[PDB]
């Protein structure tokens, strides 16, 4: 203990057979600063051990913090990292996390920042288990006020490929929606089933003028045993115009089951001169 | 203003202003507004 | 169709009368103020 | 679509009714139905 500052250093060692412990501390005071370092090492076996690196640095108008740990067990691994830069009028957070075991490895990416009173976030998650990937992407530009969002999840498999793309902005006055989903099921359990997925939703919202377009294309064929080939086709489009000047909407439900097909042409109309709707039901039925 | 202030004229002016406000809101551009805000903040910064 | 009722024009003529009277009162006040220009107030203040 | 708003006057804007019809038609060789329901308001004169 001196007028310059406090110094503390504590080092505990321990070793026997296979489990060996190496622990040390570094604590000193320099005026208005702290230089912390605890190198904590727990070596139990070669592939079976643990590591911990805790290092803190204190200084005016800034912060330094390093946090890295290591963990293994024979065929199992788990690692992580972290960066913390907290500074006035800003923010800077990053690091890594990854967990792997033999064949299946999961990798994650994260980074958090803030500048000019605007948040910034980005996350990446990559999963690869038994050859089946999972690409789920989240984009940056995540601030909170008049920000944007964009999600991208990608699923690829030997029986199902899934892909959706979403993009929307929660602007105070205008509003947009972009939904685009595509899927394809390949099922062979008790007959073939083509789980084909077509999806598209769009929407544009603004004061005194609302509108939206949805189109759906659902066609699925079921080639079962004993020539039970079943074709399921469901196709509908959703559309309506919402504004005080005029109100209307159109909806075409188009479906068919093998030899039996139905269609309905549903349209809405609402204007200052006339209002009404139209019905048209076409049914094609077999048997007696 | 008082002489020109009439019920029909006042309601006509109100309808005109609401219509122009709705027209501006419908054609409200995000990037235009952001640049306008940047210009105004820069102007305030220079003034101060 | 333009449905019109006598209460509408009754209110309109009452409003017209009120606006005329208020314009008259405002003109009276303005003439009274212009009659005693700011110089008279300044001289009275200096005398006080 | 752009926004439309009729002007506001001191009068009352009430659009007169036109005519109302119910066109229904059924197409099937088992039975065909083409009934119709129609109705309107007398617009020959406002008083009538």
Swiss-Prot record, chain A:
Domain of life: Eukaryota
N6-acetyllysine carried by residues: 274
Coiled coil: none
Membrane-crossing residue ranges in chain numbering: none
Protein name as it appears in the record: Apolipoprotein B-48
Organism of derivation: Homo sapiens
Lineage: Eukaryota, Metazoa, Chordata, Craniata, Vertebrata
Shown residues within the full chain: 1731 to 2018 of 4563
Swiss-Prot record, chain B:
Stretches assigned to coiled coil: none
Induction per the UniProt record: Up-regulated in response to enterovirus 71 (EV71) infection (at protein level).
Domain of life per record: Eukaryota
Compartment(s): Cytoplasm; Secreted; Lipid droplet
Residue ranges of the TM segments: none
Complexes and interactors: Interacts with PCSK9. Interacts with MTTP. Interacts with AUP1. Interacts with CIDEB.
Protein name, as recorded: Apolipoprotein B-100
Organism name: Homo sapiens (Human)
Residue span relative to the full protein: 2403 to 2450 of 4563
């Amino acid at each position: 203990v001196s007028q310059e500052g406090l110094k503390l250093s504590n080092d505990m060692m321990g070793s026997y057979a296979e489990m060996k412990f190496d622990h040390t501390n570094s604590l000193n005071i320099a005026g208005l600063s702290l230089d912390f370092s605890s190198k904590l090492d727990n070596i139990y076996s070669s592939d079976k051990f643990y590591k911990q690196t805790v290092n803190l640095q204190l200084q005016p108008y800034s912060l330094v913090t390093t946090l890295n740990s290591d963990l293994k067990y024979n065929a199992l691994d788990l690692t992580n990292n972290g960066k913390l830069r907290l500074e006035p009028l800003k923010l800077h957070v990053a690091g890594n996390l990854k967990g792997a075991y033999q064949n299946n490895e999961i990798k994650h990416i994260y980074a958090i920042s803030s500048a000019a009173l605007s948040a910034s976030y980005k996350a990446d998650t990559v999963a690869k288990v038994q050859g089946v990937e999972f690409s789920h992407r989240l984009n940056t530009d995540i601030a909170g006020l008049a920000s944007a969002i964009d999600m991208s999840t990608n699923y690829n498999s030997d029986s199902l490929h899934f892909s959706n793309v979403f993009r929307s902005v929660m602007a105070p006055f205008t509003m947009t929606i972009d939904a685009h989903t595509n899927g394809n099921g390949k099922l062979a359990l008790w007959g073939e089933h083509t789980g084909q997925l077509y999806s598209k939703f769009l929407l544009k919202a603004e004061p005194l003028a609302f509108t939206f377009s949805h189109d759906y294309k659902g066609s699925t064929s079921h080639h079962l045993v004993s020539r039970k080939s079943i074709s399921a086709a469901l196709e509908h489009k959703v559309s309506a115009l919402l504004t005080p000047a005029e109100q209307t909407g159109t909806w075409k439900l188009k479906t068919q089951f093998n030899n039996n097909e139905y269609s309905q042409d549903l349209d809405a109309y609402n204007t200052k001169d006339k209002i009404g709707v139209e019905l048209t039901g076409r049914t094609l039925a077999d048997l007696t | 203003k008082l002489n020109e202030l009439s019920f029909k004229t006042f309601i006509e002016d109100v309808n005109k202003f609401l219509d122009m406000l709705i027209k501006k809101l419908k054609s409200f551009d995000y990037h235009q507004f952001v640049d306008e805000t940047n210009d105004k903040i820069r102007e305030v910064t220079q003034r101060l | 169709h333009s449905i019109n009722l006598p209460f509408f024009e009754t209110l309109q003529e009452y409003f017209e009368r009120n606006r005329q009277t208020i314009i008259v009162v405002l003109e009276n006040v303005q003439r009274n103020l212009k009659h005693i220009n700011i110089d008279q107030f300044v001289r009275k203040y200096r005398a006080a | 679509p752009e926004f439309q708003l009729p002007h506001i006057s001191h009068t009352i804007e009430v659009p007169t009714f036109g005519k109302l019809y119910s066109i229904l038609k059924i197409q099937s060789p088992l039975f065909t139905l083409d009934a119709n329901a129609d109705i309107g308001n007398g617009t020959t004169s406002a008083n009538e």
